[PDB]
Design an enzyme around this catalytic site. Structure first.
Site, PDB file in Angstrom:
ATOM      1  N   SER A  52       0.832  -1.196   0.000  1.00 25.10           N
ATOM      2  CA  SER A  52       0.000   0.000   0.000  1.00 25.10           C
ATOM      3  C   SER A  52       0.870   1.251   0.000  1.00 25.10           C
ATOM      4  O   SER A  52       1.855   1.337   0.739  1.00 25.10           O
ATOM      5  CB  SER A  52      -0.928  -0.001   1.214  1.00 25.10           C
ATOM      6  OG  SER A  52      -1.893  -1.033   1.115  1.00 25.10           O
ATOM      7  N   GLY A  53       0.504   2.221  -0.836  1.00 27.55           N
ATOM      8  CA  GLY A  53       1.270   3.438  -0.977  1.00 27.55           C
ATOM      9  C   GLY A  53       2.388   3.385  -1.994  1.00 27.55           C
ATOM     10  O   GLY A  53       3.179   4.335  -2.066  1.00 27.55           O
ATOM     11  N   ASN A  80       0.040   2.452   7.184  1.00 29.14           N
ATOM     12  CA  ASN A  80      -0.443   3.267   6.081  1.00 29.14           C
ATOM     13  C   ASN A  80      -1.833   3.787   6.411  1.00 29.14           C
ATOM     14  O   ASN A  80      -2.646   3.071   7.000  1.00 29.14           O
ATOM     15  CB  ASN A  80      -0.475   2.468   4.772  1.00 29.14           C
ATOM     16  CG  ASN A  80      -0.479   3.357   3.546  1.00 29.14           C
ATOM     17  OD1 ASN A  80      -1.339   4.225   3.398  1.00 29.14           O
ATOM     18  ND2 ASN A  80       0.482   3.141   2.655  1.00 29.14           N
ATOM     19  N   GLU A  91       2.630  -8.839   3.645  1.00 31.92           N
ATOM     20  CA  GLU A  91       2.597  -8.160   4.931  1.00 31.92           C
ATOM     21  C   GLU A  91       3.346  -8.970   5.975  1.00 31.92           C
ATOM     22  O   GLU A  91       3.212 -10.196   6.042  1.00 31.92           O
ATOM     23  CB  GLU A  91       1.157  -7.920   5.392  1.00 31.92           C
ATOM     24  CG  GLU A  91       0.432  -6.836   4.614  1.00 31.92           C
ATOM     25  CD  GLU A  91      -0.931  -6.520   5.192  1.00 31.92           C
ATOM     26  OE1 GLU A  91      -1.354  -7.223   6.134  1.00 31.92           O
ATOM     27  OE2 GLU A  91      -1.579  -5.570   4.707  1.00 31.92           O
ATOM     28  N   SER A 113      -4.852   1.970   2.687  1.00 26.84           N
ATOM     29  CA  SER A 113      -4.453   0.610   2.346  1.00 26.84           C
ATOM     30  C   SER A 113      -5.606  -0.082   1.638  1.00 26.84           C
ATOM     31  O   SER A 113      -6.731  -0.091   2.144  1.00 26.84           O
ATOM     32  CB  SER A 113      -4.047  -0.173   3.598  1.00 26.84           C
ATOM     33  OG  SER A 113      -5.042  -0.072   4.602  1.00 26.84           O
ATOM     34  N   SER A 114      -5.322  -0.668   0.477  1.00 29.34           N
ATOM     35  CA  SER A 114      -6.338  -1.391  -0.280  1.00 29.34           C
ATOM     36  C   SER A 114      -6.555  -2.760   0.348  1.00 29.34           C
ATOM     37  O   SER A 114      -5.637  -3.585   0.395  1.00 29.34           O
ATOM     38  CB  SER A 114      -5.916  -1.517  -1.740  1.00 29.34           C
ATOM     39  OG  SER A 114      -6.689  -2.496  -2.411  1.00 29.34           O
ATOM     40  N   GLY A 125      -0.471  -6.536  -0.929  1.00 23.78           N
ATOM     41  CA  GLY A 125       0.961  -6.680  -0.833  1.00 23.78           C
ATOM     42  C   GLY A 125       1.322  -7.620   0.306  1.00 23.78           C
ATOM     43  O   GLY A 125       0.554  -7.835   1.242  1.00 23.78           O
ATOM     44  N   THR A 182      -2.391   2.892  -7.610  1.00 25.85           N
ATOM     45  CA  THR A 182      -3.480   3.658  -8.203  1.00 25.85           C
ATOM     46  C   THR A 182      -2.960   4.634  -9.252  1.00 25.85           C
ATOM     47  O   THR A 182      -3.597   4.827 -10.293  1.00 25.85           O
ATOM     48  CB  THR A 182      -4.253   4.402  -7.113  1.00 25.85           C
ATOM     49  OG1 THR A 182      -4.682   3.471  -6.113  1.00 25.85           O
ATOM     50  CG2 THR A 182      -5.474   5.091  -7.700  1.00 25.85           C
TER      51      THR A 182
HETATM   52  N1  LIG Z   1       5.242   6.939 -11.006  1.00 30.75           N
HETATM   53  C1  LIG Z   1       4.775   8.033 -10.359  1.00 30.75           C
HETATM   54  N2  LIG Z   1       4.966   9.274 -10.859  1.00 30.75           N
HETATM   55  C2  LIG Z   1       4.508  10.370 -10.227  1.00 30.75           C
HETATM   56  N3  LIG Z   1       3.833  10.333  -9.064  1.00 30.75           N
HETATM   57  C3  LIG Z   1       3.570   9.155  -8.451  1.00 30.75           C
HETATM   58  C4  LIG Z   1       4.038   7.911  -9.079  1.00 30.75           C
HETATM   59  N4  LIG Z   1       3.651   6.905  -8.274  1.00 30.75           N
HETATM   60  C5  LIG Z   1       2.991   7.455  -7.222  1.00 30.75           C
HETATM   61  N5  LIG Z   1       2.946   8.797  -7.329  1.00 30.75           N
HETATM   62  C6  LIG Z   1       2.306   9.726  -6.366  1.00 30.75           C
HETATM   63  O1  LIG Z   1       2.472   9.261  -5.026  1.00 30.75           O
HETATM   64  C7  LIG Z   1       1.289   9.527  -4.271  1.00 30.75           C
HETATM   65  C8  LIG Z   1       1.028   8.401  -3.279  1.00 30.75           C
HETATM   66  O2  LIG Z   1      -0.096   7.634  -3.701  1.00 30.75           O
HETATM   67  P1  LIG Z   1      -0.334   6.166  -3.088  1.00 30.75           P
HETATM   68  O3  LIG Z   1      -0.508   6.299  -1.595  1.00 30.75           O
HETATM   69  O4  LIG Z   1       0.738   5.264  -3.645  1.00 30.75           O
HETATM   70  O5  LIG Z   1      -1.742   5.717  -3.723  1.00 30.75           O
HETATM   71  P2  LIG Z   1      -2.117   4.154  -3.789  1.00 30.75           P
HETATM   72  O6  LIG Z   1      -1.660   3.615  -2.455  1.00 30.75           O
HETATM   73  O7  LIG Z   1      -3.615   4.143  -3.974  1.00 30.75           O
HETATM   74  O8  LIG Z   1      -1.333   3.645  -4.974  1.00 30.75           O
HETATM   75  C9  LIG Z   1       0.151   9.682  -5.267  1.00 30.75           C
HETATM   76  O9  LIG Z   1      -0.595  10.868  -4.980  1.00 30.75           O
HETATM   77  C10 LIG Z   1       0.810   9.796  -6.628  1.00 30.75           C
HETATM   78  O10 LIG Z   1       0.474  11.046  -7.234  1.00 30.75           O
HETATM   79 MG   LIG Z   2      -4.673   2.062  -3.434  1.00 30.70          MG
END
Ligand SMILES: Nc1ncnc2c1ncn2[C@@H]1O[C@H](COP(=O)(O)OP(=O)(O)O)[C@@H](O)[C@H]1O
Ligand SMILES: [Mg+2]
Ligand SMILES: Nc1ncnc2c1ncn2[C@@H]1O[C@H](COP(=O)(O)OP(=O)(O)O)[C@@H](O)[C@H]1O
Ligand SMILES: Nc1ncnc2c1ncn2[C@@H]1O[C@H](COP(=O)(O)OP(=O)(O)O)[C@@H](O)[C@H]1O
Ligand SMILES: Nc1ncnc2c1ncn2[C@@H]1O[C@H](COP(=O)(O)OP(=O)(O)O)[C@@H](O)[C@H]1O
Ligand SMILES: [Mg+2]
Ligand SMILES: [Mg+2]
Ligand SMILES: [Mg+2]
Lengths: 667, 373, 373, 373
Positions: free
Chosen positions: A97-98, A145, A373, A148-149, A371, A102
């Site tokens: 997560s993170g 986090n 854990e 977290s999905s 992911g 997304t």
């Molecule tokens: N390859 C990338 N290029 C630019 N920004 C990114 C990239 N990957 C993640 N980010 C940024 O990092 C931030 C963290 O998002 P994140 O918590 O990872 O969302 P999720 O957990 O749903 O994937 C996001 O707002 C995204 O804009």
């Molecule tokens: Mg997510």
């Protein structure tokens, strides 16, 4: 700039060398690495508007040997493969997560929409609007986090003759144990707190929701304000999107009513009251269940008899049974869990129906998945997550071995005989039918006079000789399983309370006859669509099997995501964090798949000082190894002489290193 | 390949069957085979020469009711085979060659009974696997316990089985041949005091219905006899299937008292309370404490209103005055054994204790004596 | 690197263990290995096939109690290994490979016992160092003295060891095989005079509890026998685990008198007072004065109320009339040996008298005969 | 004044009496008191409300059989008084106030039993003198020996008594409560495997007759079980008192094997061979030689054909391989105790060891504990 796109060509493959390569590429402002079929991405915390529509033409498949490793190459690779082999496939986004899963999904959807010059005209195909809504329904705060999905998000993009059709979304592995139970320093799904924070007044006087901080389903975490970044503005934007989806105000009001009913059911207590011959149960306060009945359009006596009495009904008679306190708690938890799952299924079905595409069309798959854990203390949810990740790691290892085999055959025919050892024993240890751990847990669920200690003792007995199992030395309530990512120690505390998802038919019959239309429709549809079982583990296994079948229907190719230090520092990271994320993702297993092989011309060139090694060899098939093997009495560890000479073994490498170090001691 | 195993509690007077994992038997019908006795006059309606339990219930007036199972032991094998075939095909509509089956049995039954049961269920129906389980252990399974004495009293047998933490005490198992059918016969013989005559089999089953719907067990016998023959407060009326009203007085509670006083039928044995106490006193002292504290019931013939209170009073009068007697009377005394069998057959650890077809074919039918109990 | 050495007084009927430097044993439980004997009927509860002392105490009714240590000597080695493994892991939760261990032993025990004890505790548990100490010297350590005769009477052995200013007299050590277990057996055999029958092992332990809770030693035997069979003042009642009340009369004090009159069991030896006097009269005169003045007790079976007064009377009748006999009866007769072992193992000057792993590996197990006593 | 003293071996299931100096008991009849249970309809035949042993044997079908002596101890005193009165008056036709009487007893019986026996036989029958002798010493008297272990196994008790040259070893006396009546109960419980049901007391005695007339003890158990369930050579038929023929297979020899394997009934004790060996190993070595060489038998329940050979094989397997085991199996195992009592009561040197009426009157009933054994 520093490419090293294919690390297979280096002298040796170690996790240290891979970490150094990734560090060098990250310092070169390079995120994606093209490891043959597989791709690796790292969260940069850096807003990179890589090119724009031009990148599709710049990073297409015509020059993969010279094109920089990029995420968007798979967009053209998918079309190139489906136009040749005439077979659709699936793409998974995996990572902790993170790790920008997304963001990667949004980028790949944008690239697929931008490749056909049509999305500008048919942008009304309302695809990605509900992603935050499914996020609020499917994400929750974890100790590591705040987003977290906790569900296997599945988006199916449909295509017909190059035209992008609508999409179908589905959920696979939602954890239903989170709704009623939650560990310390974490909390429930975000939307309950969002509703309680963005609640308008008219719901405050109408619905008794003034105890937003004292609900049992919510106060279990101990601190619900840690997520203070979220606020009622999230609720406002969620409502804006909810209205955008074409939902009337009645649907939103009904959804809020069901959520309030679940929250009120959270605050129900029982008393060990005396009865005819035993002490079974008694509802403490009837005003709360009455309020639940008022806002659910259902009889209150129905809920009393469905959460207090057990109904054993045959053709000629119907017998009511008093229930124990634990059984009543299990029934209440099952009711809450089934209500939440039905709400999620209803919303997903409606969203899919709004933008439903044509049938019998081509389709590309995008899978958002858990992911690996490994917390300080691990519970049932972590065990299920690890089992799902073990299945996916098995699939990934199969893909890697297939790539290795096809490369070997591409070199010479006769290396298809090389074998490979999979993680099937771990899958059998987890969920094999006769004496799997989950099977033992399911048996202990229905077994009379069962507790956590008995389940632990039975697990210890049946898996004492298993090499992957690890009995603790001290009499501790734990056990250790050897996953591919390392040793994980679980705690057997409160497993039996996380599996009693027993919903008798009388509850479904009561909820079918509800006066409101939405609840009755949902329960009727659930009864109509319904072999099964009655535990959380069994439903999780069934959903995992469905997901595995869906994946094997297509061709799997996916991408892993890693994370730097979690303090949100752009461009700075700890190598230990890289090692941990690399171990958790599973890319380290590629080294084990390599089991080594090096070119022979490279050995000819750079070893010009080995016994005055002659450099005048223009043939790779010339006899140079056996010449040293028999003259220097080198043990014949090699099975057979190759043509490319890719028969190198680690023992031979060690012998060569020893020879190099001893010969160098001249003066 | 998910295949739910059938659980077929073929008791002594009623057949209760269904799939494993359910909460109640799918099919319940009496175990009666009926054959017409008069002469058929209409050309064409002379072909159905055997009616299985429920059909024979519907047509009592023109046929004879025979129970294949008499006092636990299976007397007529062809009738029992017909009942099994009916309950497999015409009642559940499930082919028995694709599902394992579980069967129950009295504790001290003969061995040829088990051998023939296995032979029939392996050769005729070709069941992949079967198992024979004692009814008391299944009752304990259904009660959600692991200690205590099971008093399983069907209509063919009444037996006690003491169990402590899963270890049965086979030298303390007591079995009585006094059960519900003998209560029905005593009711038939005691109703003649008021002039009602019941001789045929259909009239015997009418008496059985009377017993089920009116009989109860009193706390004290002399006091209740005085009350009955001192007023008309205990008199109740019943309507026969032809609109003829009958009245029952002190015969209402003197029918089920023979369980505690089996000298009424002339048996030399003692009441169920005495047999339970003697079975306890055949066990160890540390066993005896928990056997006192955890008496449990099952079987249909223990559903008389007031049975638990009287047997509690009798055990307390028998047991030492300082111990606590607590008799469990769950509201599923009927088909508690089936609920226990369904729980047992649904366990994934039970998969290795079946009797596979290869085992029976290689070692013969005698393995039913080895893998059971 | 501070590492407290474990002190494990593995007596003949009870295991008393703990860390050195404490004032009381951390763990006390009987040294019993229990194995079930009946047949398991519930699928799943057939895996725990061996219960260590306290668990086997809780489940007496479905298993057999076997003592690995019979009359001091270790008979069954596997059961004793199981008890050691339990008391190391499941009871103290301390890995035995990081702590030295101290063990006790009877004086005149066989030598193969010591050799096998050292072999097991060095090869299985991999203890860094161990030591075997006689129980009487530890009793003297715990009593805070340096002279006198120790009368250590467990439930497997009863031995005297005369010590004067730290110099033991090994030719005056007397050992009797009459101990508490033989008293329990005599109580079992003498309770049948009133009709109470105790045959099983659980009933034997019930008799042991009766002995612990009711038995006492009288000053005069004929007078107390006349008093007992002249009234009902000495009669006391006990409640068995099933609420059954038993009454005990002159059997209350005729059970522990066999210590002074071992002819009741038929042994040709003499009472503990006679053996103590004979052990004194095997010592020098100057030794004899202080041995008279400083008699000390230990062991569980010397906790009978009235033992000190009678043995004082008997020694005074035996010894010359001008000497002063003073018998020490501290209120920690139970696990005084453990207190002495804890004191001994906590001394910093004791660090050089262990048996290191290198010593055992280089010279073999025979060094346990060289570095002990 | 020559007056022959009566010898009344009132065993646990049969009363064997007669005069001293004879070679066989004058009167032999079961010790059963029978009482009718049904209702008498013929005016006049409702007066005989109690039938003593043989009359109650003749009329089993209309009355209940109760044994006053259960497992050695005398439970119902009035029934035993009735049996004594019958065997004195209606059977020997000899006034008991003119003849001394000799009675037998188990070794480890309660003391109130002896006190009440003496009180009844002095106050009711006014016997001039009586004596209570252990059965094993009388068995040794009858065998014409003075050394060896007596294995007296009636139907209420089975006890060993080691004697060497007239000096008994009271600390090696072992007593088991497993006897012939428990074998009869096991036969009743094991005959149900073939469908034969025996519940009443008369059916219990029919089973006893079956045991007496058909049962035997085999040398090897596994071999004989294989032979039985490999052919029909061991099957024998018996005719019930209504002409109904029953067939017995491997149940023929599995009834008396529980003497060597008392785990079948669930007892924790060991077989008779093991108890005999343990009783020997509780004696001195010089005693042990002659105890090995002179094993002797008595009691009815040792008359099974093949008991001597198997117990010889078992003792030889237990005893050291160099010693000679010789088991005496005289053809008078039944009422050998009575022959010994008759020999003992006819000695003129025995005249001074009676219990005269003056002694009992002056010192009370407690002298039976002083002048016996
Ligand atoms: N390859 C990338 N290029 C630019 N920004 C990114 C990239 N990957 C993640 N980010 C940024 O990092 C931030 C963290 O998002 P994140 O918590 O990872 O969302 P999720 O957990 O749903 O994937 C996001 O707002 C995204 O804009
Ligand atoms: Mg997510
Ligand atoms: N409610 C009731 N009250 C009294 N007797 C009953 C009742 N229900 C059933 N019985 C008696 O129980 C007997 C059998 O019931 P059951 O135990 O369910 O079947 P089986 O004996 O075959 O297991 C019947 O003969 C009937 O007389
Ligand atoms: N309070 C007591 N009174 C009489 N006897 C006791 C008492 N406590 C223990 N015993 C006896 O002492 C015996 C063993 O006690 P102890 O000496 O502490 O163990 P060990 O003999 O193993 O050193 C037991 O068999 C028990 O019968
Ligand atoms: N020939 C025989 N074979 C086997 N058992 C016998 C035989 N004769 C007697 N018995 C058994 O011996 C038991 C009692 O016999 P006996 O010893 O003569 O009387 P008591 O036990 O009163 O001394 C009876 O219960 C009977 O079962
Ligand atoms: Mg039944
Ligand atoms: Mg001690
Ligand atoms: Mg006899």
């Amino acid at each position: 700039e520093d490419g090293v796109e294919d690390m297979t060509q280096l002298e040796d493959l170690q996790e240290t060398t891979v970490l150094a390569n990734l560090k060098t590429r990250f310092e070169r402002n390079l995120i994606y690495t093209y490891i043959g079929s597989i791709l690796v991405s790292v969260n940069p915390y850096r807003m990179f508007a890589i090119y724009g529509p031009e990148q599709v033409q710049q990073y297409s498949g015509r020059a993969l040997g010279e094109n920089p490793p990029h995420l968007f190459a798979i967009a053209n690779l998918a079309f190139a493969k489906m136009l040749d082999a005439k077979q659709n496939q699936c793409v998974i986004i995996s990572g902790e997560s993170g790790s920008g899963k997304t963001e990667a999904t949004k980028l790949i959807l944008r690239c697929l929409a931008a490749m056909n010059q049509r999305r500008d005209v048919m942008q009304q195909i309302k695809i990605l609007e509900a992603t935050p809504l499914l996020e609020a329904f499917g994400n929750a705060k974890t100790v590591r986090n705040d987003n977290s999905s906790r569900f296997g998000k599945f988006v199916e993009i449909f295509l017909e003759g190059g035209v992008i059709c609508g999409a179908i979304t589905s959920q696979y592995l939602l954890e239903k144990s989170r709704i009623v139970f939650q560990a310390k320093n974490e909390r429930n799904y975000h939307i309950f707190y969002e509703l309680l924070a963005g609640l308008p007044a008219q719901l405050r006087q109408a619905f008794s929701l003034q105890e937003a901080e004292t609900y049992y389903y919510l106060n279990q975490g101990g601190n619900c304000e840690i997520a203070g970044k979220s606020d009622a503005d999230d609720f406002r934007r969620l409502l804006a999107a909810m209205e955008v989806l074409g939902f009337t105000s009645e649907d939103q009001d009904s959804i809020f009513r069901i959520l309030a009913s679940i929250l009120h059911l959270g605050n129900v207590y029982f008393e060990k009251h005396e009865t005819d011959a035993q002490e079974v149960a008694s509802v403490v306060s009837a005003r709360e269940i009455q309020a639940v009945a008022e806002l659910l359009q259902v009889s209150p006596e129905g809920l009393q008899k469905a959460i207090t009495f057990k109904v054993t009904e045959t053709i000629r008679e119907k017998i009511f049974t008093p229930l124990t306190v634990e059984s009543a708690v299990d029934a209440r938890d099952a009711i809450a869990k089934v209500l939440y799952a039905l709400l999620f299924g209803w919303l997903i079905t409606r969203v899919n129906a709004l933008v439903s595409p044509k049938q019998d069309t081509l389709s590309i798959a995008i899978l958002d998945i858990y992911g690996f854990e490994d917390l300080s203390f691990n519970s049932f949810e972590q065990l299920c997550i690890n089992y799902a990740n073990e299945n996916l790691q098995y699939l990934f290892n199969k893909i890697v071995f297939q790539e290795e085999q096809e490369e070997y055959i591409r070199e010479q025919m006769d290396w298809r005989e090389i074998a490979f050892a999979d993680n099937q024993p771990c899958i059998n240890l987890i969920s094999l039918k006769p004496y799997g751990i989950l099977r033992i847990l399911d048996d202990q669920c229905c077994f009379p006079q069962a507790t956590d200690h008995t389940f632990l003792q039975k697990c210890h007995y049946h898996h004492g000789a298993n090499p992957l199992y690890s009995k603790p030395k001290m009499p501790l309530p734990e056990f250790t399983i050897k996953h591919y990512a390392g040793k994980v120690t679980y705690q057997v505390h409160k497993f039996l309370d996380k599996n009693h998802d027993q919903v008798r038919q009388d509850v479904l019959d009561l909820f079918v006859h509800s006066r409101t239309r939405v609840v009755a429709h949902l329960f009727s549809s659930h009864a109509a669509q319904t072999y099964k079982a009655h535990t959380v583990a069994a439903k999780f296994q069934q959903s995992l099997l469905d997901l595995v079948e869906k994946m094997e229907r297509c061709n799997p190719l996916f991408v892993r995501c890693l994370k730097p230090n979690h303090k949100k520092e752009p461009g700075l990271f700890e190598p230990d964090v890289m090692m941990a994320q690399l171990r958790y993702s599973g890319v380290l297993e590629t080294v084990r798949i390599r089991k080594v092989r090096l070119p022979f011309q490279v050995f000819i060139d750079r070893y010009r000082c080995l016994v005055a090694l002659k450099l005048n060899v223009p043939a790779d098939g010339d006899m140079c190894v056996s010449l040293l093997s028999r003259l220097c009495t080198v043990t014949p560890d090699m099975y057979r002489v190759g043509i490319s000479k890719l028969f190198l073994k680690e023992h031979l490498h060690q012998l060569l290193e020893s020879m190099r170090e001893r010969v160098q001691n001249r003066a | 390949d998910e295949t739910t195993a059938l659980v077929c509690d073929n008791g002594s007077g009623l057949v209760k069957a269904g799939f494993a994992g359910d909460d109640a038997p799918r099919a319940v019908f009496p175990s009666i085979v009926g054959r017409p006795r008069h002469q058929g006059v209409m050309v064409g309606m002379g072909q159905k020469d055997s009616y299985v339990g429920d059909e024979a219930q519907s047509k009592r007036g023109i046929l004879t009711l025979k129970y294949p199972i008499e006092h636990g032991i299976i007397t007529n094998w062809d009738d029992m085979e017909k009942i099994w075939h009916h309950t497999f095909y015409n009642e559940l509509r499930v082919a028995p060659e694709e599902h394992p089956t579980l069967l129950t049995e009295a504790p001290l039954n003969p061995k040829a009974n088990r051998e023939k049961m296995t032979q029939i269920m392996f050769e005729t129906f070709n069941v992949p696997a079967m198992y024979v389980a004692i009814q008391a252990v299944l009752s304990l399974y259904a009660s959600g316990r692991t200690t205590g004495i099971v008093l399983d009293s069907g209509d063919g047998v009444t037996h006690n089985v003491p169990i402590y933490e899963g270890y049965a005490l086979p030298h303390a198992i007591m079995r009585l041949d006094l059960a519900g059918r003998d209560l029905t016969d005593y009711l038939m013989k005691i109703l003649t005091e008021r002039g009602y005559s019941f001789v045929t089999t259909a009239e015997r089953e009418i008496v059985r219905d009377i017993k089920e719907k009116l009989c109860y067990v009193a706390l004290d016998f002399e006091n209740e006899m005085a009350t009955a023959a001192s007023s008309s407060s205990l008199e109740k009326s019943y309507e026969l299937p032809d609109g003829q009203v009958i009245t029952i007085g002190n015969e209402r509670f003197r029918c089920p008292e023979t369980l505690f006083q089996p000298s009424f039928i002339g048996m030399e044995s003692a009441g169920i309370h005495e047999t339970t106490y003697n079975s306890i006193m055949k066990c160890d002292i540390d066993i005896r404490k928990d056997l006192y504290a955890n008496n449990v019931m099952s079987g249909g013939t223990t559903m008389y209103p007031g049975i638990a209170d009287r047997m509690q009073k009798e055990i307390t009068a028998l047991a030492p005055s300082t111990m606590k007697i607590k008799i469990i009377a769950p509201p599923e005394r009927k088909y508690s054994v089936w609920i226990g069998g369904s729980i047992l057959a649904s366990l994934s650890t039970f998969q290795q204790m079946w009797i596979t077809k290869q085992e029976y074919d290689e070692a013969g039918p005698s393995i039913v004596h080895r893998k059971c109990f």
